[PDB]
């Protein structure tokens, strides 16, 4: 049916620049307006600009204007933006969406993360959280990039999970999850938090001890 | 130029009807702001809803219809399903730039209510050794899921520190969220009681520990 297929996800360093590209089916490309949007963790959703592929007419967004650059290939139905002088500001999803006369989006693509950031690979240090049902957690502290994953007793345990999205902490990431199990089970049973980080290829598990 | 404001909240139940409003700086919504509606679900998920004031976009329910009254744009739900809660945006053509408002949660409660669980950890032994301290506070099963997280430290305010997630999805559909105090080692050792107030339609429930 309609289909907007969008680049997959970049990591970039200050300075640089980037080229995301958005690849349209379903519809004659021409007709249509490619527009795009950027959301920024919580700053709402800003409108950078769209482009008419049929005559390449474009409006910005002025507050866009020195940072993008919107083009279309018209044999090849992609609808590109570069970004440029990037600074921390910029990392965001970025959405392409096809509009028309009187409407900027009806179709969505599915986002691209942006992150722009100084950080070298730096693994997890992973803190076991006990109390002393009982909830037991984990705390995967100063990683970068994304993602980590968490599974409990190497997957055994996999209801009364919560893993909860990363936060930024300077320049990397925390996060953490916790696992609630009936209060006999524990100390009896050993819980284990299994954490994997694949961009520095850690791996390790930490098993939850009775403070 | 303008801006663009929406309600931040609204709750209704299956089968209610609920208006969800857009306005603008400049005075009145017209005809030529063409204004639009589009719906968020988790996991950035966006369907456009209406164009052109009043369109529906391709494929969506007829009990979404989108008017202007009176020197408003309005997105109503005739008969609100449980799978429209999501966040919805309204966005105006002014002045050849598309202008967003803030967004609007809607909340249709397809569910009972359901407080949070709050839990509190300390710093762990290995963490205080590296002469860092960090307090989580994690905060599940909560519907509707709109909370504020609040820190004390010895009784005062905290409001710098802290970082707290966005409300999440839980498969069972209610939320969840985690707030985190880091202190160094040294300041950690200077108090005494920690607390993790968590206030959630209009009740708050508290967490609190003592250093030793
Ligand atoms: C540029 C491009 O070129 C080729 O590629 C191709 O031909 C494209 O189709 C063409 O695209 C333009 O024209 C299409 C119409 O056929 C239109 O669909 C396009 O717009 C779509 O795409 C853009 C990117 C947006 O996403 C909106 C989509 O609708 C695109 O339109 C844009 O460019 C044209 C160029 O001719 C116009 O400038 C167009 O503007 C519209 O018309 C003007 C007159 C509207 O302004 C009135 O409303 C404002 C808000 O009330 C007000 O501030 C203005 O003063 C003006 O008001 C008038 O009525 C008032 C009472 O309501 C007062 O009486 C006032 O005095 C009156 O002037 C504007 O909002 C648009 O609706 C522009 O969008």
């Known amino acids: 049916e309609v289909q907007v297929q969008q680049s997959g996800t970049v990591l970039a360093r200050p300075g640089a620049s980037v080229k995301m590209s958005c690849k349209a089916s379903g519809y004659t490309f021409t007709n249509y307006w490619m527009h795009w949007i950027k959301q920024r963790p919580g700053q709402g959703l800003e409108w950078i600009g769209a482009?008419?592929?049929?005559?390449?007419?474009?409006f910005y967004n002025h507050k866009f204007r020195a940072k993008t650059k919107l083009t279309a290939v018209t044999s090849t139905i992609t609808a590109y933006m570069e970004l440029s002088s990037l600074t921390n500001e910029d990392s965001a999803v970025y959405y392409c969406?096809?509009?028309?006369?009187?409407?900027?989006?009806?179709?969505w693509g599915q986002g691209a993360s942006l992150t722009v950031s100084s950080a070298k690979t730096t693994p997890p240090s992973v803190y076991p959280l006990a109390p002393g049902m009982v909830t037991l957690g984990c705390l995967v502290k100063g990683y970068f990039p994304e993602p980590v994953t968490v599974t409990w007793n190497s997957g055994s345990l996999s209801s009364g999970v919560h893993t909860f999205p990363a936060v930024l902490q300077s320049d990397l990431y925390t996060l953490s999850s916790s696992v609630t199990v009936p209060s006999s089970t524990w100390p009896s049973e050993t819980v284990t938090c299994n954490v994997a980080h694949p961009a520095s290829s850690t791996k390790v598990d930490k098993k939850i001890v009775p403070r | 130029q303008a801006v663009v404001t929406q309600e931040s909240a609204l709750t209704t139940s299956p089968g209610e009807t609920v208006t969800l409003t857009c306005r603008s700086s400049?005075?009145?919504?017209?005809?030529?702001?063409?204004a639009n509606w589009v719906q968020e679900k988790p996991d950035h998920l966006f369907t456009g809803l209406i164009g052109?004031?009043?369109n529906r976009a391709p494929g969506v329910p007829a009990r979404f219809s989108g008017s202007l009254i009176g020197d408003k744009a309005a997105l109503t739900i005739t008969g609100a399903q449980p799978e429209d809660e999501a966040i919805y945006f309204c966005?105006?053509?002014?002045?050849?730039?598309?202008?967003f408002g803030g967004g609007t949660k809607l909340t249709v409660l397809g569910q009972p209510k359901s407080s949070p669980s709050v839990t509190l950890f300390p710093p762990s032994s290995e963490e205080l050794e590296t002469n860092k301290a960090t307090l989580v506070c994690t905060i599940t099963d909560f519907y509707p899921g709109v909370v504020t997280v609040d820190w004390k430290v010895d009784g005062t305010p905290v409001t710098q520190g802290m970082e707290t997630t966005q409300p999440s999805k839980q498969s069972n559909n209610k939320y969840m969220a985690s707030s985190y105090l880091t202190l160094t080692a040294r300041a950690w050792e200077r108090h005494s009681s920690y607390s993790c107030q968590v206030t959630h339609e209009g009740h708050t429930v508290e967490k609190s520990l003592s250093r030793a």
């Open positions: 052109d004031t009043n």
């Open positions: 400049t005075g009145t919504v017209t005809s030529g702001n063409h």
């Open positions: 969406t096809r509009g028309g006369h009187g409407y900027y989006g009806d179709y």
């Open positions: 966005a105006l053509w002014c002045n050849n730039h598309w202008i």
């Open positions: 482009i008419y592929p049929g005559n390449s007419a474009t």
